[PDB]
Design a protein around this ligand. Sequence first.
Ligand code: T44
Ligand code: STL
Lengths: 115, 116, 116, 115
Amino acid sequence: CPLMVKVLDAVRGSPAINVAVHVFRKAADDTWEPFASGKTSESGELHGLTTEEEFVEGIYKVEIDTKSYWKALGSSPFHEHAEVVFTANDSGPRRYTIAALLSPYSYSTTAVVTN
Amino acid sequence: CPLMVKVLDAVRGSPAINVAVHVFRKAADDTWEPFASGKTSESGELHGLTTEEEFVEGIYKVEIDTKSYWKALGSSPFHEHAEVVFTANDSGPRRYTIAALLSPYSYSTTAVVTNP
Amino acid sequence: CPLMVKVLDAVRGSPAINVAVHVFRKAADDTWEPFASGKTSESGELHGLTTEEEFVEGIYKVEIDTKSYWKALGSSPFHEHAEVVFTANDSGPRRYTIAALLSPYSYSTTAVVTNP
Amino acid sequence: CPLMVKVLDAVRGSPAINVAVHVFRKAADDTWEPFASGKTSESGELHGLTTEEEFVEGIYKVEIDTKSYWKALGSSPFHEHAEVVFTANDSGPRRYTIAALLSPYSYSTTAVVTN
Ligand SMILES: N[C@H](Cc1cc(I)c(Oc2cc(I)c(O)c(I)c2)c(I)c1)C(=O)O
Ligand SMILES: Oc1ccc(/C=C/c2cc(O)cc(O)c2)cc1
């Protein structure tokens, strides 16, 4: 599990459950190729997106469908989605956690990169 | 104006207006002595808390009354307040902006510290 | 000035100066068309990106070039940029401030949306 | 485990390891009584602070010694510590996670409250 996504809800103080997450890899021609996707669990986590063999160095985009999340809760949001764009580097540690903390007009995101 | 406080609401995407703020300074006996207080304006800003003369070196606590803010809007929040505790003016006078971004179960705070 | 961008540095406690910002607007064919660009000033603010006339309804992407910022300061950061994607002016003209707070492996962004 | 503390480092993109954390309970006379304390683990977590029987309703303060953390890494910080002050309410869900994301001149904190 080299890539994990964790999503929290700052309005309810809870994991953000059943949020759609799409990961893309940047192709040679600067387009975004679908790579992996899923929905966050009851604990706000999405595991099993990729494998060590598939997750090569490159630029990746993690798109979190925040707009749909907020609308399903009956709350009016600002963003279309949250985007996290980063380079995977084999020099760095091997496990990437992308965390995001959501509010209707704001979000925070951090990377936890460990061995 | 060497100490300013700015507060935003992350639910509304607006300034957080009418937020009460209490500033304390640690006394010689290591208790928290009341130093200044005020409330944020329509722009979410609180100016005029103190003066260059009065804002001496010390350890200061800026308490932002987030629970009262949210309750006044009919919301039950998690935190009692947001506390920002820092040493000021240890290398000479500086200007401090304490910014805070509020959600019902979360907040962020940052400091912008300028000149010398 | 209907679109403004403000960027802070959470490591230094200062405005993030000379941050490049590129704004795109989604075209009829659903590609991202370049709309405006600029860089933050000494105050960490970017004004004058667009005009009320030009800033029509649409889906906009504000790309803040955080990697170039950090690399220019001799730091290797995590993200390529911070992207802020939103629908604008769907209920008539509004003024948008996009704020971002930067750390080498993290950022926060919020929107302040005002009048009608 | 009704109370857990998790601390992350936004400069290095890592858990915040060996951070001192002190929890206090507000007494009848408005003073802060020591309640529990510890140091975060290699995963930036502090488990086992209290038990269900001990963690009664009331106002609690979680003090995270951010200044010492940053100084041990050779980095100059702004805050003396980070403080998180909240009421424990038996009406709400039963497990509290206090999370904090640290930078030298900023921090974020959120509560994840679940059953
Ligand atoms: N100093 C002003 C501009 C300015 C606007 C805002 I609005 C602000 O407030 C926040 C609050 C949070 I919370 C953030 O995450 C961020 I980014 C900015 C700050 I500080 C400065 C000038 O004179 O130009
Ligand atoms: O298991 C976990 C529990 C909580 C967290 C919190 C992450 C987090 C991310 C942010 O961008 C801001 C913040 O205040 C917190 C991460 C992992």
